[PDB]
Design an enzyme around this catalytic site. Structure first.
Site, PDB file in Angstrom:
ATOM      1  N   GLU A   1       1.616   3.612   3.189  1.00  0.00           N
ATOM      2  CA  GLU A   1       2.237   3.010   4.368  1.00  0.00           C
ATOM      3  C   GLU A   1       3.762   3.043   4.316  1.00  0.00           C
ATOM      4  O   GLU A   1       4.427   2.005   4.367  1.00  0.00           O
ATOM      5  CB  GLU A   1       1.705   1.586   4.533  1.00  0.00           C
ATOM      6  CG  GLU A   1       0.213   1.584   4.857  1.00  0.00           C
ATOM      7  CD  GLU A   1      -0.452   0.247   4.645  1.00  0.00           C
ATOM      8  OE1 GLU A   1      -1.697   0.214   4.592  1.00  0.00           O
ATOM      9  OE2 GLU A   1       0.255  -0.767   4.531  1.00  0.00           O
TER      10      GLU A   1
ATOM     11  N   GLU B   1       1.248  -5.199  10.873  1.00  0.00           N
ATOM     12  CA  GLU B   1       0.699  -3.848  10.838  1.00  0.00           C
ATOM     13  C   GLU B   1       1.658  -3.125  11.776  1.00  0.00           C
ATOM     14  O   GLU B   1       1.576  -3.278  13.002  1.00  0.00           O
ATOM     15  CB  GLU B   1      -0.727  -3.810  11.405  1.00  0.00           C
ATOM     16  CG  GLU B   1      -1.821  -4.284  10.445  1.00  0.00           C
ATOM     17  CD  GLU B   1      -2.233  -3.221   9.447  1.00  0.00           C
ATOM     18  OE1 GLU B   1      -1.338  -2.653   8.782  1.00  0.00           O
ATOM     19  OE2 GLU B   1      -3.452  -2.954   9.320  1.00  0.00           O
TER      20      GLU B   1
ATOM     21  N   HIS C   1       2.945  -4.140   6.505  1.00  0.00           N
ATOM     22  CA  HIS C   1       1.978  -3.056   6.299  1.00  0.00           C
ATOM     23  C   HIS C   1       2.066  -2.062   7.455  1.00  0.00           C
ATOM     24  O   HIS C   1       2.883  -2.236   8.353  1.00  0.00           O
ATOM     25  CB  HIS C   1       0.565  -3.622   6.227  1.00  0.00           C
ATOM     26  CG  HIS C   1       0.333  -4.496   5.036  1.00  0.00           C
ATOM     27  ND1 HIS C   1      -0.418  -4.094   3.952  1.00  0.00           N
ATOM     28  CD2 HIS C   1       0.771  -5.743   4.747  1.00  0.00           C
ATOM     29  CE1 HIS C   1      -0.432  -5.056   3.047  1.00  0.00           C
ATOM     30  NE2 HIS C   1       0.283  -6.067   3.504  1.00  0.00           N
TER      31      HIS C   1
ATOM     32  N   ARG D   1      -3.574   4.704  -1.570  1.00  0.00           N
ATOM     33  CA  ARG D   1      -3.402   3.346  -1.054  1.00  0.00           C
ATOM     34  C   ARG D   1      -3.233   2.263  -2.127  1.00  0.00           C
ATOM     35  O   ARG D   1      -2.324   1.425  -2.041  1.00  0.00           O
ATOM     36  CB  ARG D   1      -4.611   2.998  -0.170  1.00  0.00           C
ATOM     37  CG  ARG D   1      -4.807   1.506   0.130  1.00  0.00           C
ATOM     38  CD  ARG D   1      -6.182   1.258   0.768  1.00  0.00           C
ATOM     39  NE  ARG D   1      -6.486  -0.157   0.978  1.00  0.00           N
ATOM     40  CZ  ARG D   1      -6.039  -0.883   1.999  1.00  0.00           C
ATOM     41  NH1 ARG D   1      -5.255  -0.333   2.921  1.00  0.00           N
ATOM     42  NH2 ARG D   1      -6.386  -2.161   2.110  1.00  0.00           N
TER      43      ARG D   1
ATOM     44  N   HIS E   1       0.832  -1.182   0.000  1.00  0.00           N
ATOM     45  CA  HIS E   1       0.000   0.000   0.000  1.00  0.00           C
ATOM     46  C   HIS E   1       0.876   1.245   0.000  1.00  0.00           C
ATOM     47  O   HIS E   1       1.756   1.414   0.847  1.00  0.00           O
ATOM     48  CB  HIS E   1      -0.947  -0.064   1.201  1.00  0.00           C
ATOM     49  CG  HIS E   1      -1.990  -1.135   1.073  1.00  0.00           C
ATOM     50  ND1 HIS E   1      -2.333  -1.978   2.109  1.00  0.00           N
ATOM     51  CD2 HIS E   1      -2.767  -1.500   0.025  1.00  0.00           C
ATOM     52  CE1 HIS E   1      -3.271  -2.816   1.706  1.00  0.00           C
ATOM     53  NE2 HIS E   1      -3.553  -2.546   0.444  1.00  0.00           N
TER      54      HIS E   1
ATOM     55  N   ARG F   1      -6.305  -7.353  -1.947  1.00  0.00           N
ATOM     56  CA  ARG F   1      -7.658  -7.876  -2.108  1.00  0.00           C
ATOM     57  C   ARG F   1      -7.687  -8.488  -3.511  1.00  0.00           C
ATOM     58  O   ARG F   1      -8.720  -8.964  -3.973  1.00  0.00           O
ATOM     59  CB  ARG F   1      -8.693  -6.747  -2.009  1.00  0.00           C
ATOM     60  CG  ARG F   1      -8.680  -5.992  -0.680  1.00  0.00           C
ATOM     61  CD  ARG F   1      -9.107  -6.874   0.495  1.00  0.00           C
ATOM     62  NE  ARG F   1      -9.363  -6.077   1.688  1.00  0.00           N
ATOM     63  CZ  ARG F   1      -8.415  -5.513   2.430  1.00  0.00           C
ATOM     64  NH1 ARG F   1      -7.136  -5.668   2.109  1.00  0.00           N
ATOM     65  NH2 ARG F   1      -8.749  -4.770   3.474  1.00  0.00           N
TER      66      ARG F   1
HETATM   67  N1  LIG Z   1      -4.722 -10.338   4.282  1.00  0.00           N
HETATM   68  C1  LIG Z   1      -5.494  -9.459   5.172  1.00  0.00           C
HETATM   69  C2  LIG Z   1      -4.756  -9.241   6.494  1.00  0.00           C
HETATM   70  C3  LIG Z   1      -5.594  -8.346   7.409  1.00  0.00           C
HETATM   71  C4  LIG Z   1      -5.766  -6.956   6.795  1.00  0.00           C
HETATM   72  C5  LIG Z   1      -4.398  -6.293   6.606  1.00  0.00           C
HETATM   73  C6  LIG Z   1      -4.583  -4.818   6.238  1.00  0.00           C
HETATM   74  C7  LIG Z   1      -3.221  -4.135   6.103  1.00  0.00           C
HETATM   75  S1  LIG Z   1      -3.391  -2.388   5.585  1.00  0.00           S
HETATM   76  C8  LIG Z   1      -5.351  -4.671   4.924  1.00  0.00           C
HETATM   77  O1  LIG Z   1      -4.679  -4.750   3.871  1.00  0.00           O
HETATM   78  O2  LIG Z   1      -6.529  -4.266   5.005  1.00  0.00           O
HETATM   79  C1  LIG Z   2      -5.789   1.160  10.478  1.00  0.00           C
HETATM   80 AS1  LIG Z   2      -5.365   0.290   8.768  1.00  0.00          AS
HETATM   81  C2  LIG Z   2      -6.313   1.188   7.303  1.00  0.00           C
HETATM   82  O1  LIG Z   2      -3.485   0.616   8.539  1.00  0.00           O
HETATM   83  O2  LIG Z   2      -5.806  -1.397   8.765  1.00  0.00           O
HETATM   84 ZN   LIG Z   3      -2.694  -1.216   7.645  1.00  0.00          ZN
HETATM   85 ZN   LIG Z   4      -1.428  -2.152   4.077  1.00  0.00          ZN
END
Ligand SMILES: NCCCCC[C@@H](CS)C(=O)O
Ligand SMILES: C[As](C)(=O)[O-]
Ligand SMILES: [Zn+2]
Ligand SMILES: [Zn+2]
Ligand SMILES: [Zn+2]
Length: 304
Positions: free
Chosen positions: A67, A266, A192, A122, A64, A140
């Protein structure tokens, strides 16, 4: 000028991948696994000392665009590897016995855009049929419960799953590389930001992996290890219940490929600065994260 303590633009990181590879030939090699929508080379660094039938760990950052601390971490890891190789017993044994495929930035087009036009972008920067809205959520876009939950079918949405799984050049290149090197890759790590969490399969449905107990305890110990440095608090568990359902993740797809250790990180923080984490926090963020990453790496090496 490139600096591990600041956010570097794409022109600089790209140059960095070539320079760090040239400065450490016995430890680093570079290759392009494909090109982005805009035709940018997707560079991959293979970190480790040559050896026979070495197992490997795959880690990517910058899925993303906004990030930025994520991109900074992959560089930091490489920084650690070359700096401490030979002085730190663990890192030396890691690099000696296994290979580390570090993908600095997957979504390069998006990253560039965040530096030139929109800091909060993003998604990728590819186009979409029937609309002027740009981009697809690369996390996704993988073939794992693709577009079934926690992902939008609207191309104007930030979690747009794309026209089809692997519809994006970037995700297709990443999936292909892993598919081609599946017999050697034992762990998948995707970085991320933010919300400070260590997640493991799955996120596309409310179900648990075969080795749930093992991943949970590992995630728990990794989080405990990270907190040892500055007391930073992380939560952990299955994606769906730890953060939210989100189909099409690379961590889930990777795990469903047979890679038993799949984790999504994260990084800092919990919302004060969010994606705009100050450069003054880069050092601390990366140093504590190194503890969790090396804890997972050590576990992997020990349970081959
Ligand atoms: N594979 C999905 C892991 C959980 C969400 C991670 C989050 C990181 S920004 C996302 O991409 O929304
Ligand atoms: C709080 As987020 C958009 O880095 O999953
Ligand atoms: Zn995130
Ligand atoms: Zn991310
Ligand atoms: Zn350090």
């Amino acid at each position: 000028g490139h600096s591990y303590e600041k956010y570097n633009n794409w022109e600089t990181i790209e140059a960095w991948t070539k320079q760090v590879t040239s400065e450490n030939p016995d430890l680093i090699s570079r290759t392009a696994i494909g090109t982005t929508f805009l035709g940018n080379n997707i560079y991959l660094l293979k970190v480790g000392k040559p050896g026979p039938n070495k197992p490997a760990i795959f880690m990517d950052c910058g899925f993303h665009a906004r990030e930025w601390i994520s991109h900074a971490f992959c560089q930091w890891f490489v920084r650690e590897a070359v700096l401490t190789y030979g002085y730190e017993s663990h890192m030396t044994e890691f690099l000696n016995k296994l290979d580390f495929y570090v993908l600095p930035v997957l979504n390069i087009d998006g990253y560039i855009y965040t530096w030139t036009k929109n800091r909060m972008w993003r998604k990728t920067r590819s186009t979409n049929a029937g609309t002027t809205c740009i981009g697809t959520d690369p996390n996704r876009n993988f073939d794992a419960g693709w577009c079934t939950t926690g992902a939008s079918t609207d191309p104007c949405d930030e979690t747009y799953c794309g026209s089809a799984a692997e519809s994006e050049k970037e995700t297709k290149a990443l999936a292909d590389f892993i598919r081609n090197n599946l017999s050697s890759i034992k762990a998948y790590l995707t970085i991320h930001s933010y919300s400070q969490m260590i997640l493991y399969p799955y996120s596309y449905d409310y179900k648990l992996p075969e080795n749930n107990a093992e991943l949970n305890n590992l995630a728990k110990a990794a989080v405990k290890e990270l907190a040892t440095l500055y007391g930073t608090k992380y939560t952990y568990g299955p994606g769906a219940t730890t953060i939210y359902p989100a189909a099409g993740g690379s961590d889930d797809w990777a795990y469903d490929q047979g890679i038993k250790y799949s984790f999504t990180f994260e990084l800092r923080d919990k919302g004060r600065y969010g994606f705009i984490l100050p450069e003054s926090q880069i050092q601390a963020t990366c140093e504590e994260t190194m503890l969790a990453i090396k804890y997972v790496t050590n576990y992997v090496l020990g349970h081959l």
